[PDB]
Amino acid sequence: TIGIDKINFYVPKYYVDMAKLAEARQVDPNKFLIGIGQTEMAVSPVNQDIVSMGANAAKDIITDEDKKKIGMVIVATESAVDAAKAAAVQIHNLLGIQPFARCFEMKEACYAATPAIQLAKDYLATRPNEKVLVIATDTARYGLNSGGEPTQGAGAVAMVIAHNPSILALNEDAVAYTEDVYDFWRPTGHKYPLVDGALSKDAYIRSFQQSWNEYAKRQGKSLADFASLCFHVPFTKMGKKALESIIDNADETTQERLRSGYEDAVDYNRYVGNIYTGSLYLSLISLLENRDLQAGETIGLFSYGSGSVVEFYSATLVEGYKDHLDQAAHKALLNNRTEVSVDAYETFFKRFDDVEFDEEQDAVHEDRHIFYLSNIENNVREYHRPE
Amino acid sequence: TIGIDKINFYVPKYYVDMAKLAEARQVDPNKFLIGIGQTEMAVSPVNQDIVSMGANAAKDIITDEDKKKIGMVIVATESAVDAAKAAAVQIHNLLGIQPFARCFEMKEACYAATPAIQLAKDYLATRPNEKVLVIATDTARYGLNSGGEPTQGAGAVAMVIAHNPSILALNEDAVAYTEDVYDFWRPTGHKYPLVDGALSKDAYIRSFQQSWNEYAKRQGKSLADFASLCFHVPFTKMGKKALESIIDNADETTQERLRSGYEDAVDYNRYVGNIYTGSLYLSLISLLENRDLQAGETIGLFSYGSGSVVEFYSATLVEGYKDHLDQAAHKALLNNRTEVSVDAYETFFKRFDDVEFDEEQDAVHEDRHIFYLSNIENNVREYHRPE
Numbered sequence: 167t168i169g170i171d172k173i174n175f176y177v178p179k180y181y182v183d184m185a186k187l188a189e190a191r192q193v194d195p196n197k198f199l200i201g202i203g204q205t206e207m208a209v210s211p212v213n214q215d216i217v218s219m220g221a222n223a224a225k226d227i228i229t230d231e232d233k234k235k236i237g238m239v240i241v242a243t244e245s246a247v248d249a250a251k252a253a254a255v256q257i258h259n260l261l262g263i264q265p266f267a268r269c270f271e272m273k274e275a276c277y278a279a280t281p282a283i284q285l286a287k288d289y290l291a292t293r294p295n296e297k298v299l300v301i302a303t304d305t306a307r308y309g310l311n312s313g314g315e316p317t318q319g320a321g322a323v324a325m326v327i328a329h330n331p332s333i334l335a336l337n338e339d340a341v342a343y344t345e346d347v348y349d350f351w352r353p354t355g356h357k358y359p360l361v362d363g364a365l366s367k368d369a370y371i372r373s374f375q376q377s378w379n380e381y382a383k384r385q386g387k388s389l390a391d392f393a394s395l396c397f398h399v400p401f402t403k404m405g406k407k408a409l410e411s412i413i414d415n416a417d418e419t420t421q422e423r424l425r426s427g428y429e430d431a432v433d434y435n436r437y438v439g440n441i442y443t444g445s446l447y448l449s450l451i452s453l454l455e456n457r458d459l460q461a462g463e464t465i466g467l468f469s470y471g472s473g474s475v476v477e478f479y480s481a482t483l484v485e486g487y488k489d490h491l492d493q494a495a496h497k498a499l500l501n502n503r504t505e506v507s508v509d510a511y512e513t514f515f516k517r518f519d520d521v522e523f524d525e526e527q528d529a530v531h532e533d534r535h536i537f538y539l540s541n542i543e544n545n546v547r548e549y550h551r552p553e
Numbered sequence: 554t555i556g557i558d559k560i561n562f563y564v565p566k567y568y569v570d571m572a573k574l575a576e577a578r579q580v581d582p583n584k585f586l587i588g589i590g591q592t593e594m595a596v597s598p599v600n601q602d603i604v605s606m607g608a609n610a611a612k613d614i615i616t617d618e619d620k621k622k623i624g625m626v627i628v629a630t631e632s633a634v635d636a637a638k639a640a641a642v643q644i645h646n647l648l649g650i651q652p653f654a655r656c657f658e659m660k661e662a663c664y665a666a667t668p669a670i671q672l673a674k675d676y677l678a679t680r681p682n683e684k685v686l687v688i689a690t691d692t693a694r695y696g697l698n699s700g701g702e703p704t705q706g707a708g709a710v711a712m713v714i715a716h717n718p719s720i721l722a723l724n725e726d727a728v729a730y731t732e733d734v735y736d737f738w739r740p741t742g743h744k745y746p747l748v749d750g751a752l753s754k755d756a757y758i759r760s761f762q763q764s765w766n767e768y769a770k771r772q773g774k775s776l777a778d779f780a781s782l783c784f785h786v787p788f789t790k791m792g793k794k795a796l797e798s799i800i801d802n803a804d805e806t807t808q809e810r811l812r813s814g815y816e817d818a819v820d821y822n823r824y825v826g827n828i829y830t831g832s833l834y835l836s837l838i839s840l841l842e843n844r845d846l847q848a849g850e851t852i853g854l855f856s857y858g859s860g861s862v863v864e865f866y867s868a869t870l871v872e873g874y875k876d877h878l879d880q881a882a883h884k885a886l887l888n889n890r891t892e893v894s895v896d897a898y899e900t901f902f903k904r905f906d907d908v909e910f911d912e913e914q915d916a917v918h919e920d921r922h923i924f925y926l927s928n929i930e931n932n933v934r935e936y937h938r939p940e
Contacts, residue, residue, distance in 0.1 A: 238668075239731075244637040250746065251738040251860035252661035259733035266767055268668050268729040269862050270661035274639035281625075281655050288675040292725070338679070342655040344626075346646035348933055351638040355742075359637065360932050380653055473638035475656050545747050546735055 168287045169331035169481060171297070172490060175448050176223035177321035177438050179532070180209035181503050182511040187316065190508040202316050203402030206437040209506050210305055210320045210518050211528035213538040216245050217253050218549060220303040221260045221537040224324035225552065226495075228261065228299065232326065237296040238268040238289065242278035242443040244352070245304040246271060247547070257301060260537055260549060275350065276398055276442040277471025278302070279323070284479070286327040287336050298327040302444035309358040310512055317401045319439025323447040332490045333454070333483075334465070339385050340479035343377045345369075350472035357519060359472075370400070371408045373476030374468050378412060381478040389413060390420045392480070393463035394427025396453050398446040398470040401439075402432045430456035437500055446470075455493040461485035555674045556718035556868060558684070559877060562835050563610035564708035564825050566919070567596035568890050569898040574703065577895040589703050590789030593824040596893050597692055597707045597905050598915035600925040603632050604640050605936060607690040608647045608924040611711035612939065613882075615648065615686065619713065624683040625655040625676065629665035629830040631739070632691040633658060634934070644688060647924055647936060662737065663785055663829040664858025665689070666710070671866070673714040674723050685714040689831035696745040697899055704788045706826025710834040719877045720841070720870075721852070726772050727866035730764045732756075737859035744906060746859075757787070758795045760863030761855050765799060768865040776800060777807045779867070780850035781814025783840050785833040785857040788826075789819045817843035824887055833857075842880040848872035 184204050185195035198204055220241060228236070239261075241254040254269035272278040279302035286298035303322035308314030349369035352359045374397065382388060389395075389412070399405030409428050413421050434452035441448060446469050453465070461483050469477045506514065510527075517524060521542060525531075530538060533550065540550040571591050572582035585591055607628060615623070626648075628641040641656035659665040666689035673685035690709035695701030736756035739746045761784065769775060776782075776799070786792030796815050800808050821839035828835060833856050840852070848870050856864045893901065897914075904911060908929060912918075917925060920937065927937040 246636065246660070247741055249633065249739040249741065249743070250631040250660075250662040252858075252862070255661070255731055255733050255860050255862065258731050265730055265732065265763075266728055267731055268864065269731045270659050270665055270668050270858075272657050272659055273633070273637075274642070274657035275637040278657055281657050285672045285676060288678065289672060291675065291678060341653055343652055344642055344645050344654055344656045345652065346642050351932075352636040353932055354634055354636065356636070376652075471639075471657075473642050475639070475642065477655065545738075545740055 167331060167335035168290050168329055169327065169336040170325050170334040171328035171331040172227040172326040173323065173333060173447070173451055174223050174227045175321055175323045175444065175451055175496070176219050177208050177499065178210050178214045179503050180211060180506045180514065181206040182209050182506055182508060184316070186508050198316050201403060203406065204316060204436060204439060207318055207439045208320045209511050209514050211514060212517050212521055212523055213528040213530055213533065213540065215247060215539045215547065216243055216303040216305065217247065217256045217547065218537040218539050219322040220253065220257050220301040220324065223322040224257065224261060224299060224301055227324055227326055232297060233261065233263050235295060235297045236263050236267055236299050237293065238286065239263060239299045240282040240286065241271045242282050242300065242302045243271060243304050244273060244275050244442050253303070260551065274475050275471035275473050276445060277469050277475045277477065279443045279447055280469035280477050283325060283327055284336070284340055290327065290329060294329060300325045300327060302447055304442035304444060306440040306442050307358060310515055312358065313363060314359065314361055317440045319441045321438055321441040321444055321448065323444040325447065331484060333487045334481040335484055337480045337482060339381065340477055341377060341381050341384055342475060342477040343373060343380065344475045345373065347474045349474060367404065367407065369474050370404065370470055371411050373470055373474050374408050374412055377468060377476040377478040389416045389424065391464065392466035393459050394431065394453060394457065395424055395466045395468065396431050396446065396450050397468035399432055399435060399449065402436055405432055427453065427457060434500065451496065454487065455491050455496060459483055461487065554718060554722035555677050555716055556714065556723040557712050557721040558715035558718040559614040559713040560710065560720060560834070560838055561610050561614045562708055562710045562831065562838055562883070563606050564595050564886065565597050565601045566890050567598060567893045567901065568593040569596050569893055569895060571703070573895050585703050588790060590793065591703060591823060591826060594705055594826045595707045596898050596901050598901060599904050599908055599910055600915040600917055600920065600927065602634060602926045602934065603630055603690040603692065604634065604643045604934065605924040605926050606707070606709040607640065607644050607688040607711065610709040611644065611648060611686060611688055614711055614713055619684060620648065620650050622682060622684045623650050623654055623686050624680065625673065626650060626686045627669040627673065628658045629669050629687065629689045630658060630691050631660060631662050631829050640690070647938065661862050662858035662860050663832060664856050664862045664864065666830045666834055667856035667864050670712060670714055671723070671727055677714065677716060681716060687712045687714060689834055691829035691831060693827040693829050694745060697902055699745065700750060701746065701748055704827045706828045708825055708828040708831055708835065710831040712834065718871060720874045721868040722871055724867045724869060726768065727864055728764060728768050728771055729862060729864040730760060730767065731862045732760065734861045736861060754791065754794065756861050757791065757857055758798050760857055760861050761795050761799055764855060764863040764865040776803045776811065778851065779853035780846050781818065781840060781844065782811055782853045782855065783818050783833065783837050784855035786819055786822060786836065789823055792819055814840065814844060821887065838883065841874065842878050842883060846870055848874065
C-alpha cells in the first residue's frame with residue numbers, strides 16, 4: 167500500500183467571531199452562524215504567509231530520518247507569493263530536507279493538493295525507500311464588505327505520502343472531471359477572486375455529481391459502500407447542500423450515516439473558514455479525529471477546484487491509524503487562538519494586502535517556537551525559525 | 554517503455570532582429586549576436602497569450618483518437634494569466650480533449666515541464682491505454698532597456714507522453730537538486746523578474762554541476778556515454794559557458810562531440826530567445842531535427858529552474874524517431890515569421906503589458922487557422938479557434 171502516513175494542519179493564532187462580524191456588517195448573526203454555517207474565521211497576521219504556514223504544518227510530522235528520504239516537496243496553492251519561484255523551495259530549505267529532491271507548486275484553484283498526493287503515490291511505486299511531502303497552503307481572501315467575505319480562512323495542511331502508510335491507503339480508483347466554467351477565478355493583478363454568484367453553487371455540485379457518477383460506473387460501487395464521505399466545502403452550508411444533492415436518491419441508512427460523517431468532517435472547518443487547497447484535507451483530519459471509523463472501512467473523497475476540476479477517489483483506513491493522529495494538539499491549536507475584534511480584523515486585513523510588518527499587532531515575541539515571516543529586504547522574504 | 558511520443562513547438566509570427574535591437578540600444582551588434590549569441594527575438598502580439606500558444610503547439614500532434622485517451626493535461630508556466638484557474642483547463646477545452654482528465658499547472662520557474670513529463674510517466678505505468686499531454690508555455694519578458702531584455706522570447710512546446718513512445722524512451726535515472734537561491738524571481742505584483750546579476754551564472758552552472766555529479770554517482774555513467782547533451786539555456790552564450798564548465802575535465806573525443814551536439818541543440822533557440830519552461834524542450838526538437846543521432850543512442854538532459862531546482866536525466870532514441878519529427882514544418886514556422894522594427898517591437902511590448910487589443914497590428918485576419926486570444930469581456934478571455 168501507498169498513502170497518507172502522517173497528516174497535520176496549521177492555522178494562524180487569531181480569529182474573528184462570526185456573530186460579531188455579522189453585527190458589524192449589519193446582518194442577523196444567524197445569517198453567518200446558520201445560513202453560511204461558519205462560527206469563527208481565521209485572521210492572518212502579516213508574520214504568517216503561505217511559506218511559514220506550510221512549514222509550521224509540516225515540521226511536527228517529519229523526523230530527521232524522514233528528511234533523508236523525502237524525494238519531492240510539492241506545494242499546492244492558489245495564493246502564491248511568487249510568479250516563478252515555487253514556495254516548495256523555500257519550505258524545503260526551512261525544513262532542512264535533503265537536497266536531492268524536486269520542489270515545485272501545483273496550481274488549479276482548490277483542487278491542487280489532490281494531483282499532488284495522487285502523483286506522489288505513482289512516483290513512489292518504484293521507490294520503496296522514499297517519501298513525499300505535500301503541503302496545501304492558502305489564504306482565502308475576498309475583501310472587506312465583499313460577497314465572499316464570510317467564507318474567508320487561512321491555513322495549511324501537510325501530508326506525508328509513504329509506503330505502508332499508517333493512516334490511509336489510497337485506492338486505485340481516482341477519476342477526475344474537467345469543465346471550463348467561470349465560477350471563481352483571479353486574473354493577474356487581481357487582489358481578490360472574481361466570483362459569479364449565479365454559477366458558484368451549480369458548478370461545485372455539478373462537478374461532484376459528474377465525478378461521482380463516473381466513479382460509481384467505473385468501480386461498480388455505490389454511496390452505501392462508504393463509511394463516510396469527505397469532500398471540499400467552501401462553507402459548511404454549501405457543503406451540506408452538495409451532500410443532500412448527492413445522497414438524495416440513496417437509502418435512509420446510507421443517508422443517515424453520510425450526514426453524521428459530514429458533521430464530523432466539517433467540525434474543524436467551522437472554526438477556520440475556507441483554506442482552498444487545504445479545505446478537503448482539513449476536513450479529513452476533522453473526520454479522522456471526530457469519528458471513530460474502524461480499520462478496513464473506506465472513505466469516499468471528492469476534491470474540487472473552481473474553474474473547474476473535480477476528482478473522486480477512495481482511501482481505506484489502516485489498523486492503528488488513531489495512534490498517528492493528534493486530536494489533543496489539534497484541539498489545542500484551535501482553542502489556544504486569540505479572538506480579535508472586527509476592527510482589529512480589518513486592520514490585519516489591510517496590513518496583509520500590503521505586507522505591512524507590525525511586531526506588536528502580530529505579537530511576534532510569542533512566536534519563538536514556530537516559523538514566521540520576520541521581514542522583507544531587497545524583495546527577499548526572511549523567516550524566523552523555531553529556536 | 555514510456556516517454557516522448559510526439560513533440561511540437563509554437564512561436565508567435567513576429568520577431569525583432571537582434572543587430573537592429575543592438576543599434577537602438579546603442580551597443581555593438583556583435584554584443585548581442587556573439588556576446589549573448591542571439592540572432593532574432595520572438596515578439597508577442599496581444600492575440601497570442603500562453604493559452605493560445607499552448608493550444609497551437611499541441612493541436613498538430615493529437616488525433617481525435619488521442620483526445621479520447623489523454624488522462625491529464627499539465628501546463629508548465631511561470632507566466633500564468635490567472636492566480637487560481639489553471640491554463641490547462643482552458644487548453645483542454647480548446648483542444649476538445651475527453652472530460653475525465655486532470656488539468657493543472659506546475660510551477661517552478663523554467664524547470665516545471667520536467668516534473669510534468671516525469672510524473673506523467675509514473676502516472677502511465679499502470680494505465681496502458683492512456684496518454685498525457687504536457688505543455689510548456691511562457692513569455693520571457695524583462696522590460697524595455699532592462700539587463701535581461703536581449704534574452705527575451707515567447708513560445709510553447711507540447712509533448713505527448715505515452716507507452717511505446719515513437720521518439721524518446723525516458724530512462725529510470727532522474728535526479729533533482731534543490732538549493733534556495735535568489736538568482737531570479739518575480740514576486741506578486743511584479744511585471745518583470747528580479748535578477749541578481751552577481752548570481753545568475755553561478756547559480757545555473759552550480760545546479761548543472763551538482764545534478765550531474767550526483768547522477769554520475771548514482772548511475773556509474775560518464776559524459777563519454779552520451780551521444781549529446783540537451784540542457785536548459787537562458788541564451789546560447791550562457792549555455793556555452795555551462796557546457797565548457799561541465800565538460801572541462803573530459804576527454805577530447807567527448808568534448809568535441811558534446812560541443813557539436815550543443816550547436817545543433819541551440820540552433821532554434823538562437824532565433825526565438827528564452828521561453829523559460831520550454832527552452833530545454835525547444836532545444837530537444839532542435840537537437841533531434843538538426844543532428845542525425847541513431848536509434849539506441851542516449852541523450853543526457855539537464856533542466857533548470859531559477860530559485861533554484863535542477864534535474865539531470867537521460868532518454869534513449871527509439872528506432873524510426875525521425876519519422877515523427879517535422880523539420881520542414883518547424884523550419885517553415887520560423888522562416889514564415891515577419892520581422893518587425895525596433896519601434897514596432899516596443900509598441901507590441903507596451904500593448905502586451907496592458908492586453909491592449911489591436912487587430913491591425915496583430916494582423917488577425919491572417920490567423921484564421923490558429924488559436925488566438927480574440928478578446929477579454931467581463932474578465933473572461935475569449936479565443937478564436939482554427940476554422
